[PDB]
Amino acid sequence: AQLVDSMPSASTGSVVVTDDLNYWGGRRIKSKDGATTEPVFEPATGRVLCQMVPCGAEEVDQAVQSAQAAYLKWSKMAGIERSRVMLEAARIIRERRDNIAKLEVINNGKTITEAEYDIDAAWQCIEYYAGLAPTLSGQHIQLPGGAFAYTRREPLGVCAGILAWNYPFMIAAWKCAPALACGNAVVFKPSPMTPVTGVILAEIFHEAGVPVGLVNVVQGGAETGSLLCHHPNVAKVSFTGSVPTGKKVMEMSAKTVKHVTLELGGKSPLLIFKDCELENAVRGALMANFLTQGQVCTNGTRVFVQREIMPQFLEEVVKRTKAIVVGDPLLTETRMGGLISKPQLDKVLGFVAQAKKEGARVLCGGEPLTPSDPKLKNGYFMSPCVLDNCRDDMTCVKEEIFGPVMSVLPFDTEEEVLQRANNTTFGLASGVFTRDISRAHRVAANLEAGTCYINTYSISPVEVPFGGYKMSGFGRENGQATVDYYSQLKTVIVEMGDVDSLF
Amino acid sequence: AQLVDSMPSASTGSVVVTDDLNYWGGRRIKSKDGATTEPVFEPATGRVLCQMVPCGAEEVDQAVQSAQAAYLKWSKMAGIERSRVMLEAARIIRERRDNIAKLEVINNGKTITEAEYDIDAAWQCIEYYAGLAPTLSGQHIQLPGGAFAYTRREPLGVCAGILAWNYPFMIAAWKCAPALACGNAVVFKPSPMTPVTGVILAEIFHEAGVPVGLVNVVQGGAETGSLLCHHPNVAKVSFTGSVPTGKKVMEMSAKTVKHVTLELGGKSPLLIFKDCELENAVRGALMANFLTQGQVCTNGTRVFVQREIMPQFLEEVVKRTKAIVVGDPLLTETRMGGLISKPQLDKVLGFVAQAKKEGARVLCGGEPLTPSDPKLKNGYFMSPCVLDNCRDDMTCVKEEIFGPVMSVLPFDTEEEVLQRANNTTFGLASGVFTRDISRAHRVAANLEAGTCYINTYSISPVEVPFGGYKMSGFGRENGQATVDYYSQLKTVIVEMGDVDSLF
Amino acid sequence: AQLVDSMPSASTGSVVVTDDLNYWGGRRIKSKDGATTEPVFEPATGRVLCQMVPCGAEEVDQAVQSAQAAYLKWSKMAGIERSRVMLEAARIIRERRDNIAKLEVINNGKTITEAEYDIDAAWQCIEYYAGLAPTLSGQHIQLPGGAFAYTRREPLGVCAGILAWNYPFMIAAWKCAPALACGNAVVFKPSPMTPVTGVILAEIFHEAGVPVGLVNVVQGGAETGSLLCHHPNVAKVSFTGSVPTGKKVMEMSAKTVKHVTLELGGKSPLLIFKDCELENAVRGALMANFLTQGQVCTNGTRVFVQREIMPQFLEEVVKRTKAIVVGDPLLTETRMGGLISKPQLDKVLGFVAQAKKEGARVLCGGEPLTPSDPKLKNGYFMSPCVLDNCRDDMTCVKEEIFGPVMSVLPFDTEEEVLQRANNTTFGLASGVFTRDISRAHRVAANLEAGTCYINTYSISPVEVPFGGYKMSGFGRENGQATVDYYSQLKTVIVEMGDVDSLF
Amino acid sequence: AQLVDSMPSASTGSVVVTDDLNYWGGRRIKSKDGATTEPVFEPATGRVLCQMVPCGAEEVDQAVQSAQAAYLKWSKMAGIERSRVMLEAARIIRERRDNIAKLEVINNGKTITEAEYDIDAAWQCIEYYAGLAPTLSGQHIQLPGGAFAYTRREPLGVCAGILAWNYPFMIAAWKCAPALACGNAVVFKPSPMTPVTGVILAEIFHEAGVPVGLVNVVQGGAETGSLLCHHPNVAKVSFTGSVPTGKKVMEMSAKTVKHVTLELGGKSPLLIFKDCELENAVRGALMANFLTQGQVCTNGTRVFVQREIMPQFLEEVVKRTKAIVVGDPLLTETRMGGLISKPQLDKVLGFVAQAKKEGARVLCGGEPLTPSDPKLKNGYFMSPCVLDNCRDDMTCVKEEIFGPVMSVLPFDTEEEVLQRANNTTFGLASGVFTRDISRAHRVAANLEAGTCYINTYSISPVEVPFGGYKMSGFGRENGQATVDYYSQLKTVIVEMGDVDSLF
């Protein structure tokens, strides 16, 4: 909190975290004793911001019990009532938008120009579900012979959220917002690489007036996350991360019959037809590939450009990608920070390497970097890369890189690309730049993904649902649809007369 | 089909099945070669109705491929269009109500008095979802700055249903009805003990005008059901059965990220307050315990009666249970047939046995039986049993028996029973007989089950949703809610102007 | 009914009606005594099909009382139950599709090619609302401090429908379908020019199994219609006709605070941009102007064509309009029958006359006609007319003609036409033929009408709502929206504890 | 505004209004020149608070034009965007809750104990619809043969509200809240007796950030209100007042085909069964009759008590009514202020007078009053009256008094009272105090009113809809239902292929 207020004077390479990162029972837990720890880094400098001590069964359980208690109280409040508290929680995040954004940058690495949006996105989500709580309802149906039935929309109990690192504050908000609006209690575990901003949100909810313990936070990784999935008092698990893990999470959740939702990854296709408007199309390809160091799950990393315009398109886009400013993330003119960790950087580079080993032709970027500024010497920087000469069978076209690497591929006919676009086990997003009313919707209707952008890309409004198809997951975040994943319907049938018995 | 037309003259112990029970590609498959088989029995006589040859990977796959093809066509039809075919499929079942009902009895064992309802229930479900297909829709929202978004409600693909034996024709209908209304293709596997009536439904849909292959049927058990869960072209699994299995099904489904819904079992509580109306209450307890040989998942097998009325209640109910006619199921005055199999009978009896070994006091029934009629000598009959002197810790009060065995237990205060009622890992149904407006809803609101009957029991209207809480499963069957389990929403966001790019 | 069965051999100029046209209490009323009458004509021949005796207060009242009785019973049935009867009523209309269609032609005048669609449209509407009845519901909301509320969706009572003549059977169906699906009783008054097919529908509902008296029919005009609006036992009036009358109907309805819905007329604009596809655009203009002798309220009678394509468009469309076959309506190759009455014909011609007197330039049609066939000598025929050289101030561009008269006008820019298109007191429909995704929706969003077709026209699906804007009326027919105009919500709030009193 | 800030020291008989009461174009209009005026009074003292100059065509029109302009801008903002402004408008009313409440008392006359609730009710309504704006949407349906349709939920235009005096600030809020949430512009006319607090709300919206002119206010009466109904640029009229006027308003609205909603009066019945809980029942009768000097439209002024308990009920309730403190409204221990005007007081007394002249038996109250405090000597006070010995035919049982007068009547059987309860031309509200689950809902289902309270009364939550039945009006305020009265659906059908033309 004070660290958040210190931000106005904070700058790259200067900050250092010192608070405790575990939070339950309405306060930060000291987590005493040795307890193996992990270093969390400042992506732009490679500096160690602090250590993070992971939670074991003992801790986790307390977190849960804490939530459990609070739920009992919070679930008794009416929507109109849970609404008030939430509206305030937002108003607060609103008033600390910047400071929080700035801190978000230091641990995550994305540019503040982005970070700021990330947070507005966070408080809007809350303010949205808040206004949606008084709407929560069930039905009343008149049945044959005077009897009638009615459903009650009830909360699930204690909801566990397992977060990812590309949008720390935003994703946590996206899971708590609907969860609480519905009357549930929450316990979430931020990515060990980005444990700091999460707890902030938690404190804010308490500060807003939430019953002590409603929002808890446990730090840690695999071991921890597992404890959450196995804990018998968690009614729901909301996971966001890689497909491989999503698969494990779902399995463990089965042992208890837990409700589950998975927003896994993707290798989404962007389709460019010759009748489009190059500039907007260039922007799309661009916006669809390099936000947050290209570490965005919904990125159209597999760009299909209709052969006729391949040249002029590929020209302007290589220029534009080279014109991207890599450097201090806390700078407003910077357009790309460092990746999340060294391992990730090496992994992303390793991909570009094998790309050319498979025939790929690198038009720009794809190599380590070293900013002029001396303090960024140890940052995890690389230059945005644009591949050319790609084949549907190349590892880079098939695998989710999760780095700033764009694969451009030519195509000739509509029927052609559709079969190629949908030819993946993934199905998160997709896009299309064209001008013909029919082709637009038609292609939209035919792509097998959960989201399809038409003449734009990477927009993620709170008013609409968001989730995957196929192995990109199921369930939704944002939009009204979501409330059904954090509530259940009890059917109450009421006989107005006498029982019809066969005995 | 002809077997269905032969029914008017059919009678207990006379029939014998001879058709092939596997169905895909729009016809019955001969399933040649030895291929280990299983005997399906006529519960009322112990006779072997026929053998059933289970499907292996080869067969299953063909089933799926068949569905797969048909889906492509059926999913292209509009709701209003899929509606027409379905309305006819019902009209047909309607016109063969009896014959089908009669055959249902022979393999299942329940009395025709019940069987008939089971089928009306089947065609109503179809006729309901049919009228609901033209309603299937998504949203259109206006977004900031001229852009707008819209969701399309799309079918899942190929839906696999794994059925149970207590309501063969009804449950299959309950899974296909919504599935098809939504544009999906179906492949279901009836319980190996009751493979016959299922395929009938399948043929009817084809006869109604469904694209060849839309509804397929594969016979078999564990091995088979597994193949369905692992098959890469099945988008959804809809399971109904025991908790133990539900758990395995969910695990296998995870390997592919399949959509899943489980309508598992239960040990639901029936609450009787002293201010109720004994007769109706007696009927409830009765209706809540002995339909279909008491092999009903939603049965209030754990009856709590408020101490003051314990005597007079327990008196009239023991008399009534003894007054139940056990015999030929195809007889209209019969009120209980034989159980599904010998093993089940021995299992149900074994429970009563250990009950008294734990202190239970048998007031009636609980032993094998032997009807006067000579042809029913080998049937699987036992007499409806009513336990007395039960404790919350006795195995019979905790375990789902799935036989005609009622456990009566006394209670004193409201707060008392609630804690006791909800003290289970189950949460399917529950009931309450009282007269005070406040207690009714209040108790309703507090029970932790998916369904709560007030002054009645065992009613299951199509207009309302039905499913479990906790480990009784998740997802719903019937009611509007269900459509969300057989459809998904694709978000299509459309930019009306130019892209806002940070590059 | 028998007259309906006689149709297979019926032919233009041969038929003659002889049944009684008033219907209530579940049978046709003899309407004895002189009682001034009106001749109903066969538009294609000018022959008198029969006389029609109008209802006075006495009769009307009986109709109402009849409905009133039946409602009491019908409103007690559950949706699922009202559904069954309706599904049958359709199945019947389905099975007499042709014969009914044929008879529809004889009194109305439209070609059977159209008539047939009109009827399928009728039974689909019923079959649609039928499947929608089991869906009818209210809400259940949890309120602060334990209390809860719930709404019941209840029928209105006795609904009065006042029909128009351009689609006799279809419009009556469109009013009864939702009315009954909701539990209401209906009393409608067909247009005195087309009283015959209406009563047919009525009988069918009875034949389907509707409670005696639920659907009644009273013949007559102004006087009669008024009695309906003033009658104290009619809860709702559903009017379709001219604006002038809609206005009177609404006034009379006020004296009792009756629910009202008005589907008045219109002078809807069709917009053709230079980037469209001429053929489809020509078809649109065509389909938007000459169905049912151009006596369609939703016709885009004010066609705006972007200047560049004005010539080639105007050429092909004048040719096509001249290629329309006017003659025997009961002939399949006929594309236009005679108008509804002599007065209407003279009125439509009078408009074309004054058109040229104001500067209009007639490119074709616009004059009386006389088919070769001798029996059609006295029919009410005229040739489809296409005006050219029109001004926004000409009477023909401003007034609803309600005859086959198309006004083509040039335009230059988008902003231009929008201001011109929306510059009317009307607001029923509108259309736009263009190819640019943005312009399409954008223009759609900006037109001030209740319906907007994009690259087509005159389609009226049952799945979606239909009604006007401005002075074209309010309320909707078809689609789910409608149910809210035939039902009301009672709020039932239930206190679970004690009253909070300030006394 | 400053007057609002002066309130902390304000006291009965001290204040005096001096601001201008007309408001449009975002500021208070000086309304110069003589222009006949009307005195607005302080009910508790009879003092003249100020004069009110009514608006003529000239003024009104400017108001409208003002709204008209602002609408153009406000309607272009997205729900999420209109939401922000509204949330603030509330937060403001929230922060001035008291001062506003206090001022409300001075002109209206109700006690501050009530006034305070009135205002919380006002800001909640806004905060509710605000959170509901981002939810505003239409549908997307897939049609036969590739085509698809979609509806846009669009604002109406300029909405006119004609208010009543019993809840000045609350009712204005109840009309603006939904109106704006939907994108409309508003112009309302407060009751000439209570013109002051209205404009406050208006200013607040502007202060919140609403486009200049979106919320306007014109003072005046009949003449003025008429101008609103006739004005050609008002798309909707939302009226609240007497039945007689509601009827005139609807007639004038017809001349333009304006959308209309009427929340007229009522003579609602309260039913007390012998199995109830007297105390709560007494409170109900009480709360249902004497809030805001009994000048509440939803009051159960016609109390039916089951004969057996008539005595003990009637005893405790006469005592309680006598125990009501009449005096200074700005006092917290006061439970009833003075009525709205002298004429109203004389009218209410005149009713009690004729009551006894018809046989009524006055058990208490019913006469003028004169508080001890000297400053209240000229107030419009009378004592709460409780009639006894009433007949269904007495003028007092049939007419809406709109004063603190309770008519108690005995009854014997359920079927009896229902016929008697529903035997009225009114149908706004009704209540029932009983304990039997079946009777409760059953009676609820059978009463013919728009609202039915069960074991409580006068609760009016924002989460649920509120409106009348029969001649008590139509349309709803509060709850989700309302949004449909401030928005309309445009159907946009889009052809994906070629036109099917018959020419």
From Swiss-Prot, chains A, B, C, D:
Gene3D superfamilies: Aldehyde Dehydrogenase, Chain A, domain 1 (3.40.605.10), Aldehyde Dehydrogenase, Chain A, domain 2 (3.40.309.10)
InterPro entries registered for this protein in UniProt: Ald_DH/histidinol_DH, Ald_DH_C, Ald_DH_CS_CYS, Ald_DH_CS_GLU, Ald_DH_N, Aldehyde_DH_dom
Pathway(s) per entry: Amine and polyamine biosynthesis; carnitine biosynthesis
Biological process terms in GO annotation: carnitine biosynthetic process
UniProt EC number: 1.2.1.47, 1.2.1.3
Pfam families: Aldedh
Active site, per annotation: E263, C297
Subunit-level organization: Homotetramer.
Official protein name in the record: 4-trimethylaminobutyraldehyde dehydrogenase
Organism: Gadus morhua subsp. callarias
Lineage: Eukaryota, Metazoa, Chordata, Craniata, Vertebrata
